[PDB]
Design an enzyme around this catalytic site. Structure first.
Site, mmCIF file in Angstrom:
data_model
loop_
_atom_site.group_PDB
_atom_site.id
_atom_site.type_symbol
_atom_site.label_atom_id
_atom_site.label_comp_id
_atom_site.label_asym_id
_atom_site.label_seq_id
_atom_site.Cartn_x
_atom_site.Cartn_y
_atom_site.Cartn_z
ATOM 1 N N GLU A 139 1.301 -4.850 0.617
ATOM 2 C CA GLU A 139 0.048 -5.415 0.162
ATOM 3 C C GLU A 139 -1.035 -4.344 -0.065
ATOM 4 O O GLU A 139 -1.740 -4.377 -1.077
ATOM 5 C CB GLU A 139 -0.444 -6.454 1.156
ATOM 6 C CG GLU A 139 -1.443 -7.409 0.554
ATOM 7 C CD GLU A 139 -0.874 -8.148 -0.643
ATOM 8 O OE1 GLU A 139 -1.468 -8.033 -1.750
ATOM 9 O OE2 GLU A 139 0.165 -8.839 -0.472
ATOM 10 N N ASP B 253 -4.871 6.914 -1.430
ATOM 11 C CA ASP B 253 -4.810 7.255 -2.847
ATOM 12 C C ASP B 253 -5.923 8.226 -3.192
ATOM 13 O O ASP B 253 -6.805 8.488 -2.377
ATOM 14 C CB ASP B 253 -4.829 6.003 -3.748
ATOM 15 C CG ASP B 253 -6.191 5.278 -3.777
ATOM 16 O OD1 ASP B 253 -7.279 5.916 -3.707
ATOM 17 O OD2 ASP B 253 -6.168 4.032 -3.909
ATOM 18 N N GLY C 215 0.248 -10.223 -3.230
ATOM 19 C CA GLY C 215 -0.979 -10.231 -4.022
ATOM 20 C C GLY C 215 -2.030 -11.147 -3.428
ATOM 21 O O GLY C 215 -2.471 -12.112 -4.071
ATOM 22 N N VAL D 124 -6.253 -6.896 1.051
ATOM 23 C CA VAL D 124 -6.278 -6.058 2.247
ATOM 24 C C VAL D 124 -6.957 -6.790 3.391
ATOM 25 O O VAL D 124 -6.646 -6.540 4.548
ATOM 26 C CB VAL D 124 -6.996 -4.719 1.999
ATOM 27 C CG1 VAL D 124 -6.879 -3.781 3.195
ATOM 28 C CG2 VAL D 124 -6.360 -4.020 0.837
HETATM 29 C C1 LIG Z 1 -5.439 3.709 -0.794
HETATM 30 S S1 LIG Z 1 -5.426 2.056 -0.109
HETATM 31 C C2 LIG Z 1 -6.442 1.163 -1.225
HETATM 32 N N1 LIG Z 1 -6.687 -0.082 -0.796
HETATM 33 C C3 LIG Z 1 -7.570 -0.749 -1.532
HETATM 34 CL CL1 LIG Z 1 -8.109 -2.262 -0.869
HETATM 35 C C4 LIG Z 1 -8.179 -0.294 -2.673
HETATM 36 C C5 LIG Z 1 -7.842 1.000 -2.968
HETATM 37 CL CL2 LIG Z 1 -8.758 1.826 -4.187
HETATM 38 N N2 LIG Z 1 -6.974 1.751 -2.302
#
Ligand SMILES: CSc1nc(Cl)cc(Cl)n1
Length: 189
Positions: free
Chosen positions: A28, A59, A86, A89
């Site tokens: 997820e 990232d 989907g 977070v």
């Molecule tokens: C790198 S983990 C992650 N998680 C979310 Cl919620 C958005 C983005 Cl930009 N990256």
């Protein structure tokens, strides 16, 4: 609301006893890292199983926005982490005993700690940076996840490889700090 996620976790993450829900937590967050807007021309995603059985996904994208959400009165990042819409977070957050969020955006490092989805303090600037991107590290709640409590490298490795072929140009690294195993999946067809 996040309280409904904690009351009925099966609904939002899948089976909490056979290990599939546990690993969906990782996928997820990965999906969000993949769906993130690019900062440069490429994306790299780094998935790490830490030796305390937490997982971090980071990232090098643009970073979750940090400015105050005018209607909600807290950082936009906090809104994203604490609201169902989907799946998101926020679900992963809800079912995590702890979650650490580090955002690098607009020359600044931002950090925030959550416990069962509840922020322990407002999103705060901790320093300066020349990089951009997001890092979510989470420790799954053992009030939610039973029987299978440990992440399994191979399950993560197999899925990220499948995703690699669907997301050309994206560099996906997998690292296990428990025994030092690593992999790199980077398809450019
Ligand atoms: C790198 S983990 C992650 N998680 C979310 Cl919620 C958005 C983005 Cl930009 N990256």
């Amino acid at each position: 609301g996040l309280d409904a996620v904690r009351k009925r976790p099966g609904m939002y993450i899948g089976d909490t006893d056979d290990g599939t829900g546990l690993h969906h937590m990782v996928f997820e967050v990965v999906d969000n890292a993949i769906d993130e807007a690019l900062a440069g021309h490429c994306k790299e995603i780094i998935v790490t199983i830490h030796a305390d059985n937490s997982v971090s996904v980071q990232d090098d994208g643009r970073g979750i926005p940090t400015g105050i959400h005018p209607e909600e009165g807290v950082s936009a990042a906090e809104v994203i982490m604490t609201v169902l819409h989907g799946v998101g977070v926020s679900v992963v957050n809800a079912l995590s005993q702890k979650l650490e969020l580090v955002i690098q955006r607009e020359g600044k490092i931002h950090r925030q700690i959550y416990e069962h989805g509840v922020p322990q303090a407002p999103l705060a600037v901790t320093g300066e940076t020349e990089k951009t991107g997001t890092m979510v590290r989470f420790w799954p709640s053992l009030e939610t996840f039973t029987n299978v409590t440990e992440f399994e490298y191979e399950i993560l490795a197999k899925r990220l490889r499948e995703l690699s072929f669907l997301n050309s140009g994206v560099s996906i690294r997998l690292r296990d700090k428990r025994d030092g195993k690593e992999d790199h999946f980077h398809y450019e067809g």
